[PDB]
């Protein structure tokens, strides 16, 4: 029969992706989301549509709190519910905005939101992915390749990332005797934030070696259908870059 | 007038002897504990007995929750109470315990105190010794040389010593600009647990090249107040390991 | 047309398999060889038996000398004038002994060790950079680069000059549209050479499986990297280790 | 007695200030040089005259060949015959210019080169220092903190640097045993070429977050200091960034 993805954030933009690859290969699929209603639905009807009961929604806030645990146990159970296993999870949901260290939201709600959806959260739904169980059960973890080079002012924002690259190894580590590989993808410049301004995002194309462009959504799925496939079946602990050399450039 | 440090987690074992060094090398000192305030108060008489009016215990639950960025603010408050000025923050406090990803503290705690502990409370104190400000202002972050070879289900913890990374890193960019260093010291195996039994203590030793054995309290010591001191005006950002070799000793 | 590969040390053991991998995916190849020539002959007709005219070998010694840069520019010569093109250089070949600070001169064994792990990728590199799509390479590095067996640091020293390589030519090039990355095997395809207990030692450390990987494991990252499900990775290196470098002593 | 240093490419800008430093705080002094015998000579009279009997030169091309062995032994020797004991090994000569991968010296002249002076030379120079060692002995390599972020067309002399990272970790654990350590210093930007146009010299300063200015010879040399002192007497296979946080800006 075939295995089942849960994907968070995978309404819009690189975790939608992530999904529609993960479905076009063959899984089924839980599309996450939080705010992004209309579109996860939107999506699970396009899915549905090519393949029937291959797709469905499971809504939850990623912030840390004390109900997250249980939230991110549903988010798993869910994909139990629709499809009677868990093969894969990806990690994507993510919050990202300014956090200065000086001034010339509460600082506690952002430290729930960037620290929960971007470590917390992926560590639980790690849990929770891990209590559950020729299988090819894997996780992928969407890091940041500018991870030792951050922007300017996103300290929290990058402490998440940091730790997720934590995560990704601890658990790499702790879960191989379970054949659970835990890998990681790390975009650079790839899809734009929505209100950045145009003249802001060729600034930011304009620094990729590799061809001065952004990846494409698709891009970055490709690395994640790699990871989860049997051609990665050696590799757990590992964190592919996918930013057209970005990371290499000094200032 | 002489300088003043706040070193958090300071009664006993590295932190005592990072208060200690900086007290030598002629600091005041902000003594922050948890629940030891009987070693605390005892270490701030011995250096009061040294130099009169020059140590003060400070007390604080490092734990993640809303008050905390309060309970930071007041830390560095203290400092500037008891000696008007703060030059050089030690973030030494730290939880360390086994959180298996499979299996009484709660998970939510248990996130609280290792995430809050290693990452979120530096942020935090970090952001209000830059916003509190001739001059050599730094910070010192105790780091884990193993941090990318973690211990077998110390999950939670490594990932707040990776974020403590990525904050260090961060940090280090943000605060450049008003002459505030941040890095970074990365101790290995160094005193063990007091309730570790002397032989599972050999095992540990046995595995450093550079003596088999840990590194002394001084030893870590030692690097911090190396990079507190002029002598590192330009080092931002830098880890330095204290660890005799053992990070690079493979399985 | 079907595009081309150029494989070092491609005779056996990893190397070969990934010459194996890459013909199965529709590539022409050049086989590098040393020493093993029977091998590399076999290899050959192995897979012109199974395409014709798709695989031809060529022998070369990638030790440092002042001739290197030479023998590096006739591999590549070699791959333009069996095929007419070379889309993939793979730098797989290696030296691998002990050379302690404390057999053969410590001149040769650096001009060994460095040559092939360091020196023949680079002046290959260039070389292929120099006679030009999906157009990459692929540096077999070392995933315990940073946790390294005692005693080998002449071979250490060129894994990690390696990784730097893989780094200055995935920037270097990549206005040219070359992609340039590494593979990065941990414990692999352990010789039957090794004593039980020994290769028991090894396999006991790995914490996926308690097993080195295979040579077509380490085949199948390399295979990811040069198609084109990889276009907007360069200077990437992939760990395949089954999590041995996660291992603390 | 007084303990001995060796120091390569000694004669001008960081080494001969971290030969200085060396002297100044007590050692006996090898300055070694290859075509400034000039600028050697003047500074071993320099501190001759502060101490007799202190400071020897030796002159040696660090260039890979047939001889480079046997050229490195010779300078270890040196130190033997001048001083009675060899305690530091400082390797910093260093070859820089740039080797393009696509269209006068030959590119196997270039190889020989960067890689000899950079990472074959401090190997066998690491070999003798040790073969005749078997107490504080180090070695400190001079590193590179952008080796990961490297300059364009400089491939040659970033694989010599990169190769010397490897060296100084395989070192640090291998001479462990013999109570010798081995780190390293990583200038990000020091010393600008005297030649180098001022308005070239500013574009790579005003990159540096840590006061928009270039690291000082006797700063990068206080992070050596720091390294062969007492100090740092478990401190191994580390390597210390000097970069006042350049390394973190992103491009
Ligand atoms: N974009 C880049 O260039 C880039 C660069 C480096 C790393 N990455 C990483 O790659 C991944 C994908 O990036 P992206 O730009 O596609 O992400 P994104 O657009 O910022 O957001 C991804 C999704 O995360 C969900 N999310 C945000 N806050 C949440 C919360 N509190 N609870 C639950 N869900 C929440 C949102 O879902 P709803 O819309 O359903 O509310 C959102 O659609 C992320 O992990 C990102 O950090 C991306
Ligand atoms: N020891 C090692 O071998 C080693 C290895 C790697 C890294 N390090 C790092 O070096 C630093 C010192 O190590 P260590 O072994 O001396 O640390 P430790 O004794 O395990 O912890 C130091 C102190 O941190 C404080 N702390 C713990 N939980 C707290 C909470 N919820 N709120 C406030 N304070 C709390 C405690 O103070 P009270 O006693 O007053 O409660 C504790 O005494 C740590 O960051 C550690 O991770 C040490
Ligand atoms: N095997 C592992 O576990 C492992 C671990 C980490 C990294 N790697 C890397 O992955 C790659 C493949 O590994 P491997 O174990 O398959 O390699 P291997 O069998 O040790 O060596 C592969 C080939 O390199 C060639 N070679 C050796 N010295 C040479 C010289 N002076 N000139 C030209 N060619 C020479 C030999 O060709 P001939 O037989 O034709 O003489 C040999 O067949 C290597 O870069 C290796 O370091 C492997
Ligand atoms: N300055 C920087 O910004 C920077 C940045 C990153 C890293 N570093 C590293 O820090 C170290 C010192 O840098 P630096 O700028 O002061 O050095 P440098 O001026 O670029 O060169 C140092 C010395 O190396 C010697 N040298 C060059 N080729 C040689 C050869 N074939 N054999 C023997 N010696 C040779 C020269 O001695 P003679 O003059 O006697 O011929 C020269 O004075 C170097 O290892 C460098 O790579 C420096
Ligand atoms: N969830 C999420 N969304 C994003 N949109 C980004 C973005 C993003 C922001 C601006 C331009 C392109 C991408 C990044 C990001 C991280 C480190 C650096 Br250096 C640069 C960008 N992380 C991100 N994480
Ligand atoms: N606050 C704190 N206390 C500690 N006592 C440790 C210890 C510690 C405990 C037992 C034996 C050696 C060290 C560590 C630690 C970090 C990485 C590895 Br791999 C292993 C342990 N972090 C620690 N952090
Ligand atoms: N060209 C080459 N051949 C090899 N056979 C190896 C081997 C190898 C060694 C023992 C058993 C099997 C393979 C490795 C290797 C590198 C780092 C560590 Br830590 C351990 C092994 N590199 C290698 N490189
Ligand atoms: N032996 C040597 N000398 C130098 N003068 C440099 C310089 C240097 C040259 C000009 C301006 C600033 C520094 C560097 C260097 C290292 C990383 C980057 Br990204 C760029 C240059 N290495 C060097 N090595």
Redesign the interface.
């Known amino acids: 029969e075939a295995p089942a993805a849960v994907v968070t954030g995978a309404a819009k933009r690189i975790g939608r992706a992530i999904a529609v690859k993960l479905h076009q290969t063959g899984y089924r699929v839980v599309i996450h989301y939080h705010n992004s209603a209309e579109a996860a639905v939107s999506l699970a009807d396009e899915l549905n549509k090519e393949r029937s009961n291959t797709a469905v929604v499971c809504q939850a806030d990623l912030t840390?709190?004390?109900v997250?645990?249980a939230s991110c146990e549903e988010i798993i159970n869910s994909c139990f519910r629709a499809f009677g296993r868990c093969d894969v999870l990806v990690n994507n949901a993510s919050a990202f905005y300014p956090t200065?260290?000086?001034?010339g939201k509460?600082?506690?709600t952002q430290?729930a939101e960037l620290?929960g959806t971007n470590?917390?959260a992926p560590?639980?739904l790690?849990?929770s992915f891990?209590?559950r169980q020729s299988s090819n059960l894997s996780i992928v973890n969407l890091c940041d390749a500018?991870?030792?080079?951050?922007?300017?002012?996103?300290?929290?924002y990058?402490?998440?990332?940091?730790?997720?690259?934590?995560?990704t190894?601890?658990?790499?580590?702790?879960?191989?005797?379970?054949?659970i590989?835990v890998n990681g993808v790390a975009p650079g410049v790839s899809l734009l934030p929505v209100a950045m301004g145009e003249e802001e995002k060729d600034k930011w194309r304009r620094?990729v070696?590799?061809?001065r462009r952004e990846?494409?959504a698709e891009?970055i799925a490709?690395?994640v259908?790699?990871l989860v496939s049997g051609?990665?079946?050696?590799?757990?602990?590992?964190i592919?870059?996918?930013?057209?050399?970005?990371?290499?450039?000094?200032?």
């Open positions: 840390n709190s004390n997250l645990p200065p260290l000086v001034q509460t600082v506690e430290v620290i470590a917390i560590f639980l790690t849990m891990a209590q500018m991870v030792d080079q951050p922007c300017m002012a996103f300290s929290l990058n402490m998440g990332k940091h730790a997720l690259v934590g995560l190894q601890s658990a790499a580590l702790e879960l191989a005797p379970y054949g590989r620094k070696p590799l061809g990846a494409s891009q490709d690395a259908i790699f051609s990665a079946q050696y590799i757990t602990g590992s592919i870059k996918v930013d057209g050399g970005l990371s290499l450039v000094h200032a």
